Scaffold this active site. Sequence first.
Site, PDB file in Angstrom:
ATOM      1  N   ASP A 136       0.984  -1.427  -0.035  1.00 61.13           N
ATOM      2  CA  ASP A 136       0.061  -0.026  -0.056  1.00 61.13           C
ATOM      3  C   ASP A 136       0.860   1.295   0.096  1.00 61.13           C
ATOM      4  O   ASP A 136       1.346   1.650   0.947  1.00 61.13           O
ATOM      5  CB  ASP A 136      -0.860  -0.230   1.466  1.00 61.13           C
ATOM      6  CG  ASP A 136      -1.790   1.224   1.462  1.00 61.13           C
ATOM      7  OD1 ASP A 136      -1.969   1.752   0.375  1.00 61.13           O
ATOM      8  OD2 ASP A 136      -2.335   1.379   2.311  1.00 61.13           O
ATOM      9  N   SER A 184      -0.875  15.381 -12.078  1.00 58.38           N
ATOM     10  CA  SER A 184      -0.826  14.969 -13.436  1.00 58.38           C
ATOM     11  C   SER A 184      -1.248  16.348 -14.134  1.00 58.38           C
ATOM     12  O   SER A 184      -1.886  17.429 -13.978  1.00 58.38           O
ATOM     13  CB  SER A 184      -1.995  14.101 -13.598  1.00 58.38           C
ATOM     14  OG  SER A 184      -2.592  13.894 -14.833  1.00 58.38           O
TER      15      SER A 184
END
Length: 330
Positions: free
Chosen positions: A35, A199
């Site tokens: 994770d 992004s």
Amino acid sequence: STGSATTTPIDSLDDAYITPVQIGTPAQTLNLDFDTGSSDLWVFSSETTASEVDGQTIYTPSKSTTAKLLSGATWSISYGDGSSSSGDVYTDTVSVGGLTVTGQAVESAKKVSSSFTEDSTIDGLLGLAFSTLNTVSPTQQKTFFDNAKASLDSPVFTADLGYHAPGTYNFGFIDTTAYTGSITYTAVSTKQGFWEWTSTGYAVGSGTFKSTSIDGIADTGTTLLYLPATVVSAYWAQVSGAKSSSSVGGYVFPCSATLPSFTFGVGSARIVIPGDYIDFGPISTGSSSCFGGIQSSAGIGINIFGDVALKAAFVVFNGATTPTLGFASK
Ligand SMILES: C[C@@H](C(=O)O)N(C)C(=O)OCc1ccccc1
């Protein structure tokens, strides 16, 4: 040193991925959920409340000659999905894919929430976010990667998750045969303890690319792709019959639909998520309504590039002094 381990989807939907981890001496192999959105290595154990164990493999520290109770240390964690676990702490030897760390904090669960009990395939979590998020008290502990990184050939790990297929976590090296074209690296902020990056935009299907900054986290422990409501609405508007359902908890779409791809930007590069990766199957057994793999982050507080996005790429988690993320197509 290096390590390399295969990671395997837990079910036919790729809801999560499990990776075998050797703990203790002799080794006890548990299948952990790696994770990159958390920083605790915790396991089902011989100390876990018996009614809360249902098929998981447990760590028994009394059977490990290298286990040592970390005196006074406790841990307690709550995850974004509302699940939680807590317990005490041992140090022990932990190996992943041939890479060994001695003295790793292994957080032994005394209590786990129902969602963990109900998933017999996941024996615990191995956190790969920054150690500042580790919950051990009163002395915070280091992640497996943090403990290993000085010994590694290069201070990196890579995630190569499969679509409906196994993939690979590598530590200490970049397998140049595992991706196509070049690895495009981007800046990371560690201020919230996550692999947080920006992004450069998105496209829906064959549509034009929208240049827009989308801050979010690279999180292997989250199944889906959670993005701003504007982006998500633009995606689902291209699927006839798709709608957001408050009842179900997100966007649903006809199971008869063919889904469009979704592209996200990494610098000037582009990662294409095929439409099929966005199909999470019937909302209930036998329903003709299917659960979408792109969902709104509006209720979270952060955008999350979970497995839906990451499994479309070869992803480098660069843990050098000034950390960075790399993405390549594959
Ligand atoms: C030159 C740079 C850019 O995007 O401007 N680039 C292509 C690139 O990969 O930069 C990655 C990076 C970010 C932060 C610190 C070190 C390296």
